[PDB]
Amino acid sequence: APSYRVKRMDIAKNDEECVVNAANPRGLPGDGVCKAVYKKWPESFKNSATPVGTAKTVMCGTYPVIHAVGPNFSNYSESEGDRELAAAYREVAKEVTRLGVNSVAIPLLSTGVYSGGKDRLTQSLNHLFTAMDSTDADVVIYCRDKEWEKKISEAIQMRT
Numbered sequence: 022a023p024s025y026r027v028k029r030m031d032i033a034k035n036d037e038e039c040v041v042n043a044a045n046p047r048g049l050p051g052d053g054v055c056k057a058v059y060k061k062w063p064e065s066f067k068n069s070a071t072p073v074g075t076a077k078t079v080m081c082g083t084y085p086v087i088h089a090v091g092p093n094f095s096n097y098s099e100s101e102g103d104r105e106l107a108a109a110y111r112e113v114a115k116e117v118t119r120l121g122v123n124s125v126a127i128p129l130l131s132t133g134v135y136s137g138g139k140d141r142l143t144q145s146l147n148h149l150f151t152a153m154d155s156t157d158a159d160v161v162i163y164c165r166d167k168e169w170e171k172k173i174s175e176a177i178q179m180r181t
């Protein structure tokens with residue numbers, strides 16, 4: 022029976038069969054979060070460039086890295102941002118299904134340096150749910166803040 026779980030820890034130490042990288046459209050290593058993914062799976066960044074609102078899988082050996090590019094809300098309108106953030110998660114669902122994996126480690130896209138200084142926990146998480154509800158993979162959501170862990174954990178609780 023496929024579950025959603027949340028873990029407050031480095032996504033680069035996930036124990037799922039694949040990872041989603043919160044990526045930039047240039048396929049650049051990045052800093053903070055993407056840096057952890059670059060350091061862990063540097064060969065997954067070969068031709069990882071993909072436009073905003075898309076996802077691209079690059080294998081690191083047999084381990085799939087799904088580069089998913091949420092919008093930078095600094096650059097987008099609230100309405101266009103929202104559209105691009107929905108589409109990014111939909112492309113993630115498609116890659117997870119295509120790969121036939123049983124589990125996936127996923128961050129909340131567009132909630133860090135791409136949030137345009139706003140709190141987007143509920144926006145990002147609902148788009149994730151919309152996309153991943155139609156898949157049969159175990160989903161493990163990774164976050165850093167304890168407050169965020171609690172809020173995500175409750176949003177999971179109150180749909181079961």
Ligand SMILES: O=C(O)c1ccnc(=O)[nH]1
Pocket residue numbers: 043044045089090091092129130131132133134135136
């Ligand atoms: O702000 C973020 O967490 C983020 C950085 C890069 N790509 C994203 O989808 N999101």
